[PDB]
Amino acid sequence: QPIDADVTVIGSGPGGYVAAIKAAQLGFKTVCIEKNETLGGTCLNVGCIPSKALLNNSHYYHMAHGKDFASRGIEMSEVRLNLDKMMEQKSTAVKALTGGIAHLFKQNKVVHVNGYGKITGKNQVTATKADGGTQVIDTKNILIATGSEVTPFPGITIDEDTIVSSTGALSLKKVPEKMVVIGAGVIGVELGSVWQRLGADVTAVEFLGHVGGVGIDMEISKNFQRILQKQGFKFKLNTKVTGATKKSDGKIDVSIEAASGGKAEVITCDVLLVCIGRRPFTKNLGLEELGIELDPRGRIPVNTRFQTKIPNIYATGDVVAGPMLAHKAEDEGIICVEGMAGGAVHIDYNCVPSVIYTHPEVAWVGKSEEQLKEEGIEYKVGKFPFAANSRAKTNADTDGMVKILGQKSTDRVLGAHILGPGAGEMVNEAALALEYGASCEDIARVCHAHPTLSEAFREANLAASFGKSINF
Amino acid sequence: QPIDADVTVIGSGPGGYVAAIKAAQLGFKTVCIEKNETLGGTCLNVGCIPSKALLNNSHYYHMAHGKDFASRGIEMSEVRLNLDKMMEQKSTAVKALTGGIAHLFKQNKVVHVNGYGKITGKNQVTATKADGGTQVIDTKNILIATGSEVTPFPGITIDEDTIVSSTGALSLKKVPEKMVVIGAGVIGVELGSVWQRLGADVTAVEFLGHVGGVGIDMEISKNFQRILQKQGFKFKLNTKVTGATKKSDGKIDVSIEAASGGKAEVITCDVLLVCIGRRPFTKNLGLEELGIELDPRGRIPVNTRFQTKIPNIYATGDVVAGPMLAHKAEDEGIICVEGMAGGAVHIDYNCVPSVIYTHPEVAWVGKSEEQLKEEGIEYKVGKFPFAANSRAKTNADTDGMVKILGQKSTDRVLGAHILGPGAGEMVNEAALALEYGASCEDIARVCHAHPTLSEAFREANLAASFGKSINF
Ligand SMILES: Cc1cc2nc3c(=O)[nH]c(=O)nc-3n(C[C@H](O)[C@H](O)[C@H](O)COP(=O)(O)OP(=O)(O)OC[C@H]3O[C@@H](n4cnc5c(N)ncnc54)[C@H](O)[C@@H]3O)c2cc1C
Numbered sequence: 001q002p003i004d005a006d007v008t009v010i011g012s013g014p015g016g017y018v019a020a021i022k023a024a025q026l027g028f029k030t031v032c033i034e035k036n037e038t039l040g041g042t043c044l045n046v047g048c049i050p051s052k053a054l055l056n057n058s059h060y061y062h063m064a065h066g067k068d069f070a071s072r073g074i075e076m077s078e079v080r081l082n083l084d085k086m087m088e089q090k091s092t093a094v095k096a097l098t099g100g101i102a103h104l105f106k107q108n109k110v111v112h113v114n115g116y117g118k119i120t121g122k123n124q125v126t127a128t129k130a131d132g133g134t135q136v137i138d139t140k141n142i143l144i145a146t147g148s149e150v151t152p153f154p155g156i157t158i159d160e161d162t163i164v165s166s167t168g169a170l171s172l173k174k175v176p177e178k179m180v181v182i183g184a185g186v187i188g189v190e191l192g193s194v195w196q197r198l199g200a201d202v203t204a205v206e207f208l209g210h211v212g213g214v215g216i217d218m219e220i221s222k223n224f225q226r227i228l229q230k231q232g233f234k235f236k237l238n239t240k241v242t243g244a245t246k247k248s249d250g251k252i253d254v255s256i257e258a259a260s261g262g263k264a265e266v267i268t269c270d271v272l273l274v275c276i277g278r279r280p281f282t283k284n285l286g287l288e289e290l291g292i293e294l295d296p297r298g299r300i301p302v303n304t305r306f307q308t309k310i311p312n313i314y315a316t317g318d319v320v321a322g323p324m325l326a327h328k329a330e331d332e333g334i335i336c337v338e339g340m341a342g343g344a345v346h347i348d349y350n351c352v353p354s355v356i357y358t359h360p361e362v363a364w365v366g367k368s369e370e371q372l373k374e375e376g377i378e379y380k381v382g383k384f385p386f387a388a389n390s391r392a393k394t395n396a397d398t399d400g401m402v403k404i405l406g407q408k409s410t411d412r413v414l415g416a417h418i419l420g421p422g423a424g425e426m427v428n429e430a431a432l433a434l435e436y437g438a439s440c441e442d443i444a445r446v447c448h449a450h451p452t453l454s455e456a457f458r459e460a461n462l463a464a465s466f467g468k469s470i471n472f
Numbered sequence: 473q474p475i476d477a478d479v480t481v482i483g484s485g486p487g488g489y490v491a492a493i494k495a496a497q498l499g500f501k502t503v504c505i506e507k508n509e510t511l512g513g514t515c516l517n518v519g520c521i522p523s524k525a526l527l528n529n530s531h532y533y534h535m536a537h538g539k540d541f542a543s544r545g546i547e548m549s550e551v552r553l554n555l556d557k558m559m560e561q562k563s564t565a566v567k568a569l570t571g572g573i574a575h576l577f578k579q580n581k582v583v584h585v586n587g588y589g590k591i592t593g594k595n596q597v598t599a600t601k602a603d604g605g606t607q608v609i610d611t612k613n614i615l616i617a618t619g620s621e622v623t624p625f626p627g628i629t630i631d632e633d634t635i636v637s638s639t640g641a642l643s644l645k646k647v648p649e650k651m652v653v654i655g656a657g658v659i660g661v662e663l664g665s666v667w668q669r670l671g672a673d674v675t676a677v678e679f680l681g682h683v684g685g686v687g688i689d690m691e692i693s694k695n696f697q698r699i700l701q702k703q704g705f706k707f708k709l710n711t712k713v714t715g716a717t718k719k720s721d722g723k724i725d726v727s728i729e730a731a732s733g734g735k736a737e738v739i740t741c742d743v744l745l746v747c748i749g750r751r752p753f754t755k756n757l758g759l760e761e762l763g764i765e766l767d768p769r770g771r772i773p774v775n776t777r778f779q780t781k782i783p784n785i786y787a788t789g790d791v792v793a794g795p796m797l798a799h800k801a802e803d804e805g806i807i808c809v810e811g812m813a814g815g816a817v818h819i820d821y822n823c824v825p826s827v828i829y830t831h832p833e834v835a836w837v838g839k840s841e842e843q844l845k846e847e848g849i850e851y852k853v854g855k856f857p858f859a860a861n862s863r864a865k866t867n868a869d870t871d872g873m874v875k876i877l878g879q880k881s882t883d884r885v886l887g888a889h890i891l892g893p894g895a896g897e898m899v900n901e902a903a904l905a906l907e908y909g910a911s912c913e914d915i916a917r918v919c920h921a922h923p924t925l926s927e928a929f930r931e932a933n934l935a936a937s938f939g940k941s942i943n944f
């Protein structure tokens with residue numbers, strides 16, 4: 001009647017669903033508990049996969065509705081948007097990738113239980129399904145992958161109809177004629193670009209003086225904001241939000257002020273997206289009874305082998321500290337279940353890439369010029385514009401640069417920052433180079449194809465090691 | 473007018489113009505000679521850059537003139553083609569990239585002499601313009617970057633109007649109702665897909681039984697063929713050409729025969745593309761006088777320092793052996809002039825990547841399954857479909873795979889073969905890996921961002937190291 005297992009994973013997010021497959025392949029009789037009807041967690045159901053699809057489709061619309069396709073001799077008339085099919089394709093891809101996780105849990109002999117899991121004891125988790133029936137799992141180890149949730153703004157309640165979160169902004173029924181986005185982070189900037197390409201008047205408000213979020217280079221952030229501001233993205237940065245009111249007009253009066261409070265304006269929008277961030281989700285789990293406290297932000301503190309104060313209970317993902325990105329949770333899930341099977345658990349979050357999937361794309365691996373200034377590390381700067389990269393000018397996407405930072409003495413690649421085309425696929429090369437402890441010269445002396453956008457990466461590294469690049 | 477110089481470079485091709493800039497940066501009084509009106513060589517004026525530009529715009533057209541855009545809700549009414557605007561984007565990019573080399577040549581203080589170069593002496597080069605001063609360049613070292621030319625077809629005279637080659641096919645005024653391409657290699661497959669997307673009955677005739685030329689993996693070339701055949705491409709592999717006639721109608725009859733015998737057919741077409749291959753160019757160079765004999769293929773025999781029989785005379789590029797690729801010539805040009813400065817010259821023609829810039833893309837590096845069996849090496853195979861990659865299923869590019877080959881004992885990556893989206897930029901990661909001598913497990917344990925097409929590279933390496941993949 002109960003389930004006896006070795007590793008029980010509370011969560012089907014990226015950190016959890018991978019760890020279940022991995023632990024299953026390593027011999028561990030694995031069990032995964034998921035509360036939501038669909039598997040995949042945020043990234044699949046209401047996260048990376050939906051946002052990327054609309055980002056992709058919105059760009060192709062903005063190209064047809066703009067001079068882009070006519071510039072290349074693709075002359076069309078009456079370019080119109082059927083948001084239904086665009087949202088349908090988003091749903092079709094999410095639905096298809098939900099079924100992938102199911103097929104994987106099936107062929108990799110993982111047991112799925114559709115309930116809300118609470119750690120009843122040090123070696124048992126009880127999951128309450130929607131019917132009220134409880135499935136008691138008795139397990140040797142327990143992995144906490146409860147994931148994350150949206151941080152609510154004080155004084156505003158997301159109704160997911162006109163005051164929406166990321167969840168609602170991925171399923172808007174018609175293009176808002178005006179949209180205000182609180183939070184110029186990754187999700188905010190991305191989602192704002194999707195709807196603005198479809199005709200929305202998007203203005204993003206941020207208390208901070210930079211767009212992008214934590215970990216972006218100041219030079220990259222500024223140049224990124226400029227290109228977006230010329231695409232139609234209006235940015236009210238250094239601006240504090242005071243309040244909001246769901247007018248009887250159907251619209252939402254948004255009251256804003258400066259961080260100092262000097263200028264007090266009020267803007268009005270058809271749709272308000274609150275994207276001030278996300279936070280660790282640890283509700284109704286049983287951590288207080290187990291006597292494991294959280295940290296100030298609400299994260300479960302862990303060690304190198306990713307276990308809490310109770311050793312047989314492990315925790316990975318957005319729940320624990322570190323960059324709340326999908327691939328990070330995946331890795332953490334892999335190293336953790338390998339540490340359980342006997343392995344050297346070592347992950348370097350400095351080699352963790354970050355990708356803004358806008359167009360222009362922003363993507364970086366390593367330390368910013370400012371992070372190194374704080375740490376006192378003296379460095380060199382190498383830069384190659386995509387205006388001088390061959391495949392860019394052949395494709396006409398000649399916006400942005402690749403900035404390579406390297407220590408003066410060691411020439412070691414400290415950080416890499418890419419603004420422009422194909423930056424997302426590019427950082428995975430800079431990631432491999434960072435893991436291999438490469439220098440700027442080490443990359444420059446590698447055969448890079450022609451014509452590719454990777455040549456900007458090689459030549460920017462060359463601009464650091466040699467001082468001068470070839471084609472710039 | 474004599475020109476006292478340190479290093480004189482004959483040819484503005486990729487191997488020449490890069491080495492001229494590099495040698496000038498190394499301190500040499502570098503001189504470059506070009507017989508044509510524009511710099512850049514074959515790749516920039518009549519090669520990679522123009523072919524890639526049309527491939528980009530033509531793929532964009534085929535998406536609109538089909539179902540791709542409307543599948544995502546991007547609904548246009550009537551799609552037309554202004555070919556005299558697409559060819560302009562091709563020309564505008566080539567012109568801009570040509571002017572780039574000019575500014576760089578002037579920046580690094582390289583002497584551009586516009587004449588036909590011939591080696592009058594061991595330390596003397598004389599260039600004859602069509603009419604001019606017939607400049608003498610007394611130099612210490614001489615670099616032969618004389619390049620390549622269109623290998624002709626015996627029995628077929630290239631008209632460049634209806635009997636076109638790489639050049640003429642890139643500058644056609646109208647779309648042929650039916651086009652026939654001789655040579656199903658890289659250049660053939662690429663340009664054939666350009667006009668097929670633009671509306672043409674394109675058939676490719678090949679003596680060999682594989683597309684993509686020499687080096688491509690059998691399974692990859694075969695799978696590439698299947699997809700190309702669903703996109704309208706027609707392939708007459710294992711078929712020899714026996715004649716071509718220009719009729720008074722202006723059409724061309726092609727006399728084809730099954731190489732073994734029989735299956736003799738006549739093919740009428742509007743335009744004939746002859747791109748069976750290319751051969752080095754050593755014409756009117758003075759090598760016979762100097763005594764530099766050539767191998768049977770007409771290439772210049774060079775040593776590891778890329779010297780000819782006479783040391784001060786060096787040769788690099790398509791004029792020497794190795795794959796006829798521009799990034800090969802670029803690297804060969806750099807390491808050569810650095811060998812003059814005293815640096816060690818080392819080059820591995822296995823870490824040289826090959827990319828077919830079609831949709832779907834083909835890009836590989838290392839050894840094929842056939843080549844590994846030809847050298848008696850036992851290997852593991854790892855595959856990951858792009859149909860399982862998150863970013864591909866998101867962008868609806870669920871076509872192709874990544875194949876990883878690693879020795880059954882050392883697990884060292886021996887060949888990485890990519891068919892599908894983003895292969896052109898993804899392959900440069902495998903180049904860095906092979907240069908760093910990585911194993912399948914080395915790449916698999918590196919953080920790859922989500923969602924990126926690079927995850928297919930990681931997962932395929934895992935499918936060869938662990939045997940099983942996470943998401944497949
Ligand atoms: C709009 C948006 C776009 C994003 N884009 C990107 C991007 O491009 N790249 C990127 O790297 N990251 C992106 N992210 C972030 C990424 O989605 C998250 O970092 C990651 O998915 C969270 O990993 P996780 O498994 O720890 O959390 P989750 O995915 O939230 O996993 C938790 C899962 O477990 C369930 N659960 C929780 N508690 C219990 C319980 N007690 N019992 C049973 N089940 C439970 C939850 O319902 C959920 O399904 C994006 C996020 C959003 C919101």
Ligand SMILES: Cc1cc2nc3c(=O)[nH]c(=O)nc-3n(C[C@H](O)[C@H](O)[C@H](O)COP(=O)(O)OP(=O)(O)OC[C@H]3O[C@@H](n4cnc5c(N)ncnc54)[C@H](O)[C@@H]3O)c2cc1C
Nearest residue numbers: 483485487507513514515519589619620789790796797798
């Ligand atoms: C359609 C097409 C697509 C291609 N795509 C790719 C691709 O994607 N990637 C890739 O790597 N390669 C590609 N190539 C091949 C690429 O163009 C060549 O491999 C490369 O350009 C040759 O290098 P090189 O240094 O010999 O330059 P070349 O251009 O071959 O060198 C010859 C140059 O020297 C000049 N010259 C010749 N004789 C003299 C003389 N006596 N005096 C002065 N100057 C002289 C010529 O005018 C020319 O400018 C493609 C080729 C074609 C036709």
